[PDB]
Design an enzyme around this catalytic site. Structure first.
Site, PDB file in Angstrom:
ATOM      1  CD  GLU A 171       0.014   0.137   9.238  1.00 25.80           C
ATOM      2  OE1 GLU A 171       1.021  -0.072   9.951  1.00 25.80           O
ATOM      3  OE2 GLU A 171      -1.127   0.253   9.735  1.00 25.80           O
TER       4      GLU A 171
ATOM      5  CB  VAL B 117     -12.361  -1.301  -1.601  1.00 19.18           C
ATOM      6  CG1 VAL B 117     -12.188  -2.078  -2.948  1.00 19.18           C
ATOM      7  CG2 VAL B 117     -11.628  -2.004  -0.409  1.00 19.18           C
TER       8      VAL B 117
ATOM      9  CG  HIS C  98      -1.838  -0.300   3.203  1.00 16.17           C
ATOM     10  ND1 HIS C  98      -2.691  -0.901   4.104  1.00 16.17           N
ATOM     11  CD2 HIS C  98      -0.618  -0.851   3.418  1.00 16.17           C
ATOM     12  CE1 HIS C  98      -2.021  -1.790   4.819  1.00 16.17           C
ATOM     13  NE2 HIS C  98      -0.758  -1.774   4.427  1.00 16.17           N
TER      14      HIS C  98
ATOM     15  CD  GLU D 299      -0.664  -7.868  -1.014  1.00 12.27           C
ATOM     16  OE1 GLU D 299      -1.521  -8.658  -1.486  1.00 12.27           O
ATOM     17  OE2 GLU D 299       0.139  -8.210  -0.122  1.00 12.27           O
TER      18      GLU D 299
ATOM     19  CB  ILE E  43      -2.714   2.250  -4.980  1.00  5.17           C
ATOM     20  CG1 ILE E  43      -4.207   1.958  -4.642  1.00  5.17           C
ATOM     21  CG2 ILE E  43      -2.322   3.798  -5.035  1.00  5.17           C
ATOM     22  CD1 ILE E  43      -5.235   2.278  -5.748  1.00  5.17           C
ATOM     23  CB  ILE E  44       2.145   1.446  -4.679  1.00  8.38           C
ATOM     24  CG1 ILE E  44       2.065   0.386  -3.569  1.00  8.38           C
ATOM     25  CG2 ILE E  44       1.529   2.837  -4.261  1.00  8.38           C
ATOM     26  CD1 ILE E  44       2.909   0.754  -2.232  1.00  8.38           C
TER      27      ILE E  44
END
Lengths: 257, 257, 257, 257, 257, 257
Positions: free
Chosen positions: D174, D202, D144, D88, D83-84
């Site tokens: 977070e 997901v 997230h 990751e 997503i960003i």
């Protein structure tokens, strides 16, 4: 502390591997008796087939190099058993470049057809697996070919043969000159029969099928359909000691400067 | 923010640079009108001569890339004006590889003679700078040559010409086929005259001396001594719009996938 | 998200691994209680023996780093448990250099004998595993040695001992000063007995055989044959808390600047 | 010879993997039907759980790339399903950078929220999984979050929503804006109910627990405790075809320039 | 196409540069008469002083390598004129590692004091610049020293001298053994006079000041204050043909394997 | 041997450079008084203008690093004076990554707006250059903006301001939120006047023109046209000691772990 890594394209066919890749590894190891001998293959597909069908584990060049670094080899000599400087050899060049900093000394010896002198020496070496021919008969060599620019090697060698009236021709399955080019050219000379030999390190069943099978696009059927009967000889180049000696000279040229 | 970097072998001769390297840079810039245009040469010797004799500063590919990164170009397209994939093109490949991490997007377009289709398209392009010939006359193309393995390109192209009965031949100054190979082969066909053209991007005085001078080893004197009169045509390939269009298609293939 | 990777030469002998490598990993983990603890060995041969004989899997430094990157550790501190800056430590340096770009922060703490102060601190630390000696008795330390240029470390430390009249000597199995140099030198001082201790992180059976066995080339038999009775002490350096504290200070120096 | 590698954060929950990661891989493979399809996950912890609990082997991006190079893929297109642009995605960028020299052509397509237009297109795409709301009801998206600086993406998207009076809000578990920021802000508008949806590829059980469980710190309990009843919708973004189409456009933008 | 690059620490003093660095470059070029000769210095400060005071431009190793790549040298042999494997030599190793991919073949020959045999050969070479001494006189060699771990080399060489009763000692200005260590040790032998010689490639005015000046911390004043009169000999090691021959053997060992 | 390299975006305007970039370099050098101070700029265009117009030579980060390696600095601390993690900061990251192997120790300190705590600390720091405002007046900060994904930083900071009822707003010239977003939002609060301040390290004439000029698209004219009178304050952030202290804490966080 010293290693010799011999990198082949590879084969899943055991008998041709022994007669060709092993015979080359044997000769290279004898010329560097101070080196421990290691193997890797460039063909991942062949490596995968060997694992899954046979439970035989062959390293890629990256894995072989990681293991050599782990075991403390500071000095690694690598020799390619490839015929040309195409994608397969370059896979070696790139993996070597990546992991080069892991070693104090590395060298990398080049494929059979690299310099102008290689082509001259290869013609001399091929002469030792050829029969004595009548003037209307020739040997025809069948290479793999390439999409990479090094595909030009096969035509250059064919061109040298023709220029010096060497009694052979060279072409490729997957690239120029394809078999119909050679057939048209030989038919125009009144060549009456040919012997087909692979210009590949090993002669596995698929090479054998391209060259020799009863499929209409095999090189043998194509020559036969042109009225030039073809006799297939199913040995890889690795089986020719004068070819092995060129791979040995390349390793030794990589070693000295 | 977008750049186009065009890398030539180079020349110290101003008039041939303008007629060839500039004409190619012009066409490539027109096909990428959203890009700022930059130049670099691979020949350090030529760069040095230009600085010391002329006070003209041409970048190496490394310097051009450092400057592009400094000026904030995130997206750089590079096109080689080389003829073959030899040491000169590889100098580009290696410098690009080193500095690639300095850019968000990089591509690199390949030399004229790379893929099988390039050779076919080059024969078509050369046809537009050739005269209408009589059946006993041919054009002879003179390439640089190479010790690198890509020297095989010149013979492969000559081989394609011969196979398709294209009315030209190709050889190299410094590598196989050298001019005597072509002369022996043309004499055997009963070729009666030739036109010599360079198979080089530019035609500088030294190329002109190899091809055309009164030195006994010039290609013209060699053909003349064989009783096949030779007429030199002193244009570089850059002067042929169909060659420029191949360099434009290579840039555009590097851009798209 | 933070890791501590502790890299040893390694050992296949479980009891010495626990008394030495584990005791060091324990101390380093306590000094970085915000770090998850990981192990790797430089000796690939030892790693292979552990896998094949014991079913125990120890990572090489490359594998440990790949796994750390995979698990999302952005900040990795590595400490070498090596004694010198030779081939083994450099294997760490090179693998770290290769994979450094996979991490936001990496540091690497150096072997025991690195700076001038390390040698002074090591002499102080060794003093805590030595007995109170009579004036004609000395401790003799037995290092591995090296062909790499860092083999000079062992003689430099021996030289410092002698200069300051520290009651010990240092040499190496595989490099200068070998045991006969120390024996000749001690015999000339009228040294009457020695205690042999390893200058190695662990004391595995082979170290023990070089130092202590009944083989005529063991250090003990050599001293005994010179009429200087030798008492072997079979602990590795890892068993000495003042040595562990030097490894802890190196990690902490790698952490701060 | 061409590959498509699709890299997800990953999930150990099979049903959400199928509904989201598989649906995206399916769409990307359809847009590149000349590519062989491969998978890798960035989350090493998730990879480890799949191996140890399920006997399922998912590659890291490094392993996938090594295998692609081994199998002879010269041309690899990679698309991130992140997503960003945080830790990751950067794991992909770094591993790609390391192994880039192993390939003739590589590209890498970016996470969902990269450019200014991505945010506008994402708002449009989210509109297709939202109900028709009354004026005092809103959708709340739960991302997230990140410690990496790209955590700023979630607030920027929330800011765009508010500026254009889009009937949704965005925050993160977070990182900023945390749920209490949105609750205070919505309470001040007299918002009367919300629908919670994940802003994650997901929706695995742990995401579901952060959003929806009966734990007092779940987003649902927090909204409920503020007197704004919350209805959880447990789909991942991968289940929305307009989100899949943005991932497809990113791959295609990586492919073209 | 072949280059020889000779990398010195450097000097701003012209007469010592000629007698030492030039004499070594001369010998190395004679042993590789097929190589074009190039120079670089590791000391940036010295390079800067030469530019600003003298208008003399000396390359760093990085600049020399960039220029070699630009000029088309595919095969570069580099020889370090350093005495030890410390920070200065490592600057070469690191720059070579960075630019290695720009060359088909590179080698790098090591500093004077690298292997165990180097130390033995250096003692033999030093013997040819020493006088015939009386039994109470010795030569004292003055090295630079290092903070890098390779500082251990100077003590190791001193240790070898002492062990074999060679009539010389070695120490360092900036590291162990410092001159007072040697003075205490020689005073205890009843050594009555010494000859001071530099263990440095060149003897520039600052080396000369450390060794020979009337400053109380010069090595000469220190020996004199201990009642051991000192005679300074102001030649660099480069002036000794047997030292030059070791640098020549190192280049040749880098060339062969 | 230790360096501090301070890398700015840069400016061609001397007075703003002194009041901002010099004031930051001064503070950073004072916090590392054991470091020699060096400068580099990321903006190549600004570097070029300074050379050509002023005869002032400012290094790029690559040139500064090459020079540091040449001069023998083993330990280099670098601090970015950038505001965000966009293309400019990444130019530093990439050049650092390339040349990292040239140094024993390197660190790199991050831009002002990196972590969640940076945003909180920046709001606190901005409070020290703001006046005491009436309840219907606000400060408006004008950032550069970015096409890179880090443009999200400006909206995230604006979002934090609004959430905590800090009496300021933030937007960007070249990216979201643009001034009209803030104007619409402030007009809806009944804000009656604003003070414009740059959210840029320096305030050069072009920043001043975007913020303050009489051009209809200046931020001042836009606010004025909305009936909210605007008073421009022409200081860069570098002029605020609490901003300088954040850059100092970033360097010190890069130094410690």
């Amino acid at each position: 502390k010293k290693a010799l890594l011999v990198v082949s394209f590879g084969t899943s066919y055991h008998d041709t591997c022994e007669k060709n890749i092993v015979a080359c590894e044997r000769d290279l190891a004898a010329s560097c008796p101070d080196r421990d001998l290691f193997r890797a293959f460039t063909s991942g597909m062949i490596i995968r087939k060997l694992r899954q069908r046979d439970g035989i584990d062959i390293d890629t060049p990256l894995q072989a190099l990681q293991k050599l670094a782990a075991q403390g080899y500071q000095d690694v000599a690598i020799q390619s058993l490839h015929i040309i400087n195409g994608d397969e050899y370059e896979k070696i060049v790139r993996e070597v470049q990546l992991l080069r900093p892991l070693f104090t000394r590395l060298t990398l010896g080049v494929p059979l057809l690299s310099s102008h002198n290689d082509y001259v020496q290869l013609m001399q070496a091929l002469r030792q697996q050829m029969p004595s021919l009548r003037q209307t008969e020739k040997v025809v060599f069948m290479g793999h070919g390439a999409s990479h620019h090094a595909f030009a090697a096969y035509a250059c060698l064919d061109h040298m043969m023709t220029a010096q009236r060497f009694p052979a021709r060279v072409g490729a399955v997957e690239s120029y000159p394809e078999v119909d080019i050679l057939i048209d050219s030989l038919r125009d000379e009144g060549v009456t029969g040919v012997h087909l030999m692979p210009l590949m390190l090993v002669a596995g069943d698929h090479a054998i099928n391209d060259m020799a099978s009863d499929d209409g696009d095999s090189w043998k059927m194509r020559f036969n359909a042109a009225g030039i009967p073809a006799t297939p000889w199913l040995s890889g180049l690795g089986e020719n000691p004068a070819i092995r000696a060129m791979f040995v000279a390349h390793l030794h040229q990589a070693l000295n400067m």
